[PDB]
Design a binder for this molecule. Structure first.
Ligand SMILES: Cc1cc2nc3c(=O)[nH]c(=O)nc-3n(C[C@H](O)[C@H](O)[C@H](O)COP(=O)(O)O)c2cc1C
Ligand code: SF4
Ligand code: SF4
Ligand code: SF4
Ligand code: FES
Ligand code: FES
Ligand SMILES: [K+]
Lengths: 43, 429, 263, 213
């Protein structure tokens, strides 16, 4: 058991598209979205 | 109980607050997260809401509303629209940085809280609105969410309970006002972060016009542990109607500014010296404390001597717990300049939608700037007090109140300083 | 059967559910002051001039947006209501420009008139005022946007009545500005109606500019012949000359709008 | 800063901008996060993505976002001018953002701001002639217990002193990127000079679980 070091070092290597790459990576898991029934409020 | 604030480590909820253990799924599980999540989900929303109610949990976002009752507005038959949980991670209140630590060091507690809290509300998904400056924190949360998806803890058949739940992360673009619950919803919908009038309340017409509950990160993140250990365990900490543990941020003029978890109702002096290492220059050097973020009125040293940190105690002290972000100011502080900077902050953050804050807060900012230099007359102090009362209670959202209260606190306890500055300026001109 | 009972200053009124506090007051002939509210636009609730006290309620409510509850007693003339109106009016006038003599709205201005009736009689604003640059939106509507009180009536009219999403707010806080952001012309066949709905002299008729004051015009109620709709109009004349054309409300024909050719 | 747009040679509707093909894949995933019929919800993330590709937002970038999501251009201009993180004019390679609100002001954020201005030879709100750094002040960045602090692009640098901020600039100016986080010796938000809580090993699964679950 160590309590002396910092275990949150991954974010030192994050890049400009890191957040959006993960979001794209997650699309395969999402349940199908619900539909309001039209294309947009102006349709 | 009469004394509070010697919380044991075994009773602490955010056990990776300092990021000294693996923040990822393997470490989170080793620390008790995600344990028996299926059983909680199978107990049903009424059981989950019952636990949240008996814990006496209150909103940790700054308003302190009873969580169990608030979450119960969503327990109703579906009318065809989807139901959503929106988790507030906007963290904009100056002095407050607690939600940042949860998001980056205990992300799996927040994700599990979203599933448990979402189940009680009947929501199909959780939208986590995190401020856009927290880029690295948001990426940590997304990494944790990907881990949970791949282990089946969320998504279709979450934790094997047959409940489908998605967790989305949406980033802001730089607006303190987007922490307000209806402004947050409008921001998620792609508009300016301008609050909505109420009614309708979000539980009826919310994000995308659908039933919605907005919950602070800390309020959500503790819900799985309240369910596992029970509301009675949580309610055994702090005074009645002030239950549980709380994350505190001690910044300003203290030897060791820090974030720490402590029991609700701990003495303010006890908190500052046990955890922050005391006031810079010793307790006698203390001038004033803002006990709950920039929106709560300051209290002077005399009040700080014996005030407890909970919703009721600080209200009786003519302030509020707020986010429990303690800003400390010692005798070397220009107190007028310190508050003026907060009014300047609220001037920069006001959405501009409604008249008393769009015009009033900018007006108060101009008066405070002259008060800093002493370039005013003593009659203007009562004018400024009256102006702040014309903003409070007359605006769409509470940002207007949050700008008036700091001014009222300064006039309440530091009028002679304001008048002394005016004398100096007049004497020199 | 479906009506519920509310009180306006202790006077019982039966209203359908969904009726706002402002609408309930209209039923007893009391007109709540307003700026952002227009009965033909979506409810905005941003000017706060309609704040009114509900008996046994600590917080005043926006009468234009708040639906009335059973048994409420709306106190339209209480001290709490009067002080809310004075405070809101004080904030509206803090940055408003001293333009009345040169401003075409003068004499038929809702800001002037509600200041007289519901606001204080003096200023305690000791600072400098805001000033914003003007926007060119065409040859029909002159904009003096320092006079704008950010009521968003023009935005809501353009989007909802005219179906043109060209107007909006840019910026934040005290710097929030109504306009098009880019240089654009608001040239729609119903565009001239934003002159009427703008409560202040921020939007004014360019052809009409500086030619007359409201109190001196004679009003002839007449009919429009530029199309076959038959829009009801008022012809404003002075000393035997036609000065302008205004809409005349007719619910079954043109409501309270006219086309730009008619105007 | 002005909240009206005037066309110029460097920033007009014909200024060239389009998302890269890879960024169109990222846009598709963004739009799928929201209910069908509510694509306007993607304005903020997509507008921010256009900035992450181009560095700032020309009016042509705002027009493209409106076109892709089928929203009126004015509704995108409203968002772009409402949120402070959108750069409506070019910024330097390194956008230095110094928090100067009261919690940071109490811990001497003015010294940090003066240190940066002295080193870069620019005033707050300016860009260096090399166009490597832009300097501005910002409101609370949510790291008050680590004051004084700055944000450079996506990274926080906290517990700063004039010496520490000069080293960070020297590293960015030298092509390297410095490590984010506190520079005072501590790792994150724990009190300096030793922990006061969470000193014992955390309990394991099932600890303190109520009966009947
Ligand atoms: C100007 C303003 C900013 C706010 N910012 C936050 C915030 O950053 N985080 C938060 O949880 N609540 C914030 N709130 C409070 C929320 O509106 C809301 O009360 C809270 O998120 C409800 O969640 P809770 O019951 O768990 O506290 C803010 C309110 C105002 C008026
Ligand atoms: S009080 Fe201020 S921030 Fe809140 S809606 Fe009104 S103008 Fe916007
Ligand atoms: S809009 Fe009304 S109050 Fe303002 S300058 Fe014109 S006439 Fe005077
Ligand atoms: S220009 Fe006139 S109608 Fe439009 S927001 Fe300003 S005051 Fe209201
Ligand atoms: S008329 Fe009700 S807030 Fe404007
Ligand atoms: S006051 Fe600077 S990070 Fe909060
Ligand atoms: K007008």
């Amino acid at each position: 058991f160590d309590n002396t070091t910092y275990k949150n070092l991954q974010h030192h290597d994050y890049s400009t598209y890191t957040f959006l790459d993960l979001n794209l990576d997650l699309s395969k898991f999402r349940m199908p979205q619900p539909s309001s029934g039209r294309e947009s409020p102006r349709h | 109980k009469t004394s509070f604030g010697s919380l044991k480590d075994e009773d602490r909820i955010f056990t990776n607050l300092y990021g000294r253990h693996d923040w990822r799924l393997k470490g989170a599980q080793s620390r008790g997260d995600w344990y028996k999540t299926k059983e909680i989900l199978l107990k049903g929303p009424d059981w989950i809401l019952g636990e949240v109610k008996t814990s006496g949990l209150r909103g940790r976002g700054g308003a302190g509303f009873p969580t169990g009752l608030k979450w119960s507005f969503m327990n109703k038959p579906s009318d065809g629209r989807p139901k959503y949980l929106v988790v507030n991670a906007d963290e904009g209140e100056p002095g407050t940085c607690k939600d940042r630590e949860i998001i980056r060091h205990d992300p799996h507690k927040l994700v599990e809280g979203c599933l448990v809290g979402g189940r009680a509300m009947g929501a199909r998904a959780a939208y986590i609105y995190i401020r856009g400056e927290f880029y690295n924190e948001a990426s940590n949360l997304q990494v944790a969410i990907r881990e949970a998806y791949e282990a089946g803890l969320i998504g279709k058949n979450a934790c094997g309970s047959g409940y489908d739940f998605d967790v989305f992360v949406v980033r802001g673009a730089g607006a303190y006002i987007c922490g307000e619950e209806t402004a947050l919803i409008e921001s998620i919908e792609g508009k300016q972060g301008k609050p909505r009038l109420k009614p309708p309340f979000p539980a009826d017409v919310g994000v995308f016009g659908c039933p919605t509950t907005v919950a602070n990160v800390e309020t959500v993140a503790v819900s799985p542990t309240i369910c596992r250990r029970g509301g009675a365990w949580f309610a055994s900490f702090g005074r009645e109607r002030n239950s549980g543990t709380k994350l505190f941020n001690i910044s300003g003029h203290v030897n060791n500014p820090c974030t720490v978890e402590e029991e609700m109702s701990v003495p303010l002096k006890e908190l500052i010296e046990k955890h922050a290492g005391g006031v810079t220059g010793g307790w006698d050097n203390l001038l004033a404390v803002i006990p709950g973020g920039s929106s709560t009125p300051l209290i002077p040293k005399s009040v700080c001597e014996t005030v407890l940190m909970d919703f009721d105690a600080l209200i009786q002290a003519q302030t509020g717990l707020g986010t429990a972000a303690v800003i400390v100011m010692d005798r070397s502080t220009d107190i007028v300049k310190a508050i003026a900077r907060l009014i300047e902050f609220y001037k920069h953050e006001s959405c501009g939608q409604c008249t008393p804050c769009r015009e009033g807060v900018d007006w108060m900012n101009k008066v405070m700037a002259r008060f800093v230099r002493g370039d005013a007359r003593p009659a203007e102090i009562d004018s400024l007090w009256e102006i702040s009362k014309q903003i409070e209670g007359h605006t769409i959202c509470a940002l207007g109140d949050g700008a008036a209260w700091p001014v009222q606190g300064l006039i309440r306890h530091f009028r002679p300083e304001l008048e002394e500055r005016m004398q100096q300026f007049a004497q020199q001109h | 059967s479906n009506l519920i009972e509310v009180f306006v200053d202790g006077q019982s009124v039966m209203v359908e559910p969904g009726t706002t506090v402002l609408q309930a007051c209209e039923k007893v002939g009391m007109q709540i002051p307003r700026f952002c509210y227009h009965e033909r636009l979506s409810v905005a609730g941003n000017c706060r001039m309609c704040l009114v006290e509900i008996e046994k309620a600590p917080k005043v409510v926006a009468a234009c947006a708040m639906p009335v509850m059973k048994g409420w007693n709306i106190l339209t003339n209480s001290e709490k209501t009067k002080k809310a109106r004075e405070g809101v009016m004080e904030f509206l006038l803090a940055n408003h420009p001293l333009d009345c003599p040169i401003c075409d709205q003068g004499g038929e201005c809702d800001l002037q008139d509600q200041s007289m009736m519901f606001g204080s009689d003096r200023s305690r604003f000791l600072e400098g005022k805001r000033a914003v640059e003007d926007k060119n939106i065409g040859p029909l509507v002159k904009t003096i946007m320092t006079r704008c009180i950010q009521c968003t009536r023009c935005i809501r009219f353009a989007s909802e009545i005219a179906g043109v999403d060209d107007l909006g707010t840019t910026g934040r806080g005290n710097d929030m500005q109504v306009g098009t952001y880019i240089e654009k012309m608001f040239m729609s066949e119903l565009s001239g109606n934003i002159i009427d709905i703008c409560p202040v002299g921020a939007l004014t008729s360019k052809p009409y500019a500086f030619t007359a004051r409201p109190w001196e015009t004679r009003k002839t109620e007449s009919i429009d012949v530029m199309d076959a709709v038959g829009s009801n109009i008022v012809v404003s004349t002075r000393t035997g000359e036609v000065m302008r054309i205004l809409p005349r409300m007719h619910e079954d024909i043109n409501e309270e709008w006219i086309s730009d050719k008619t105007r | 800063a002005l909240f009206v747009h005037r066309d110029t040679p460097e920033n007009n509707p014909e200024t060239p901008f389009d998302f890269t093909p890879e960024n169109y894949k990222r846009i598709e995933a963004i739009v799928k996060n929201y209910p069908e019929g509510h694509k306007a919800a993607a304005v903020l993330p997509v507008l921010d993505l256009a900035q992450r590709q181009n560095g700032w937002l020309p009016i042509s970038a705002m027009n493209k976002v409106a076109e892709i999501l089928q929203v009126p251009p004015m509704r995108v201009y409203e968002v772009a001018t409402f949120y402070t993180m959108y750069n409506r004019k070019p910024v330097g390679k390194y956008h230095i953002q110094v928090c100067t609100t009261t919690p940071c002001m109490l811990r001497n954020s003015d010294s940090i701001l003066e240190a940066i201005q002295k080193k870069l030879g620019i005033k707050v709100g300016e860009t260096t002639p090399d166009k490597l750094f832009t300097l501005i002040e910002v409101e609370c960045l949510g790291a008050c217990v680590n004051a004084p602090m700055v944000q450079i692009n996506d990274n926080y640098y906290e517990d700063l002193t004039p010496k520490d901020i000069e080293e960070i600039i020297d590293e960015l100016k030298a092509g390297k990127i410095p490590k984010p986080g506190p520079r005072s010796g501590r790792f994150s938000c724990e009190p300096a000079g030793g922990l006061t809580s969470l000193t014992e090993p955390p309990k394991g699964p099932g600890f303190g679980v109520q009966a009947g679950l």
